[PDB]
Design a protein around this ligand. Structure first.
Ligand SMILES: Cc1n[nH]c(N)c1C#N
Length: 165
């Protein structure tokens, strides 16, 4: 199972780790992808997870979009986890670099409550432009299920832990 995680709350855990390496090690039931509405997995966590699946995640995602149209910002869909997890929960956090409403970050985290346990990144953090300290606070105050957060950046991980209320 999950190892080396620091417990933040009753249900939120955090580790300085690459979510792709973490997924290959643990093979969780659910890995969360930091998706966009088009499921175009170009960069950040999405690009890394997709590259780990040899582009199978992108092929599956394009078929999903062709059938269903784009997701909503704050929404999600469950697709295959390929070689990383049983399932991938593609969650769209607001991209503040695209002028999207940051109030939608709580709606994005609410998707995690449909799964008992998840391996996840901080939503809207990194290339999505939001403050990761704010994302962790919204995560802790929204998610009630067991969430194992993988924070790639060491310096950000230390800042998140040392500033956690
Ligand atoms: C989380 C995570 N895992 N691997 C990455 N490249 C990220 C980011 N950002």
């Amino acid at each position: 199972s999950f190892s080396g995680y620091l417990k933040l709350t009753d249900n939120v855990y955090i580790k300085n780790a690459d979510i792709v390496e973490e997924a290959k090690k643990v093979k969780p039931t659910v890995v969360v992808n930091a998706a966009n509405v088009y499921l175009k997995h170009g960069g950040g966590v999405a690009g890394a997870l997709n590259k780990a699946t040899n582009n199978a995640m992108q092929v599956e995602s394009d078929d999903y979009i062709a059938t269903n149209g784009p997701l909503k910002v704050g929404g999600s869909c469950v697709l295959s986890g390929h070689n990383l997890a049983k399932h991938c929960l593609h969650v769209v956090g607001p991209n503040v670099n695209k002028g999207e409403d940051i109030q939608l970050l709580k709606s994005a985290y609410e998707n995690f409550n449909q799964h008992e346990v998840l391996l996840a990144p901080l939503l809207s953090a990194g290339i999505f432009g939001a403050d990761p300290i704010h994302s962790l606070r919204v995560c802790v105050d929204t998610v009630r299920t067991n969430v194992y957060l993988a924070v790639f950046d060491k310096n950000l991980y230390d800042k998140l832990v040392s500033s956690f209320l």
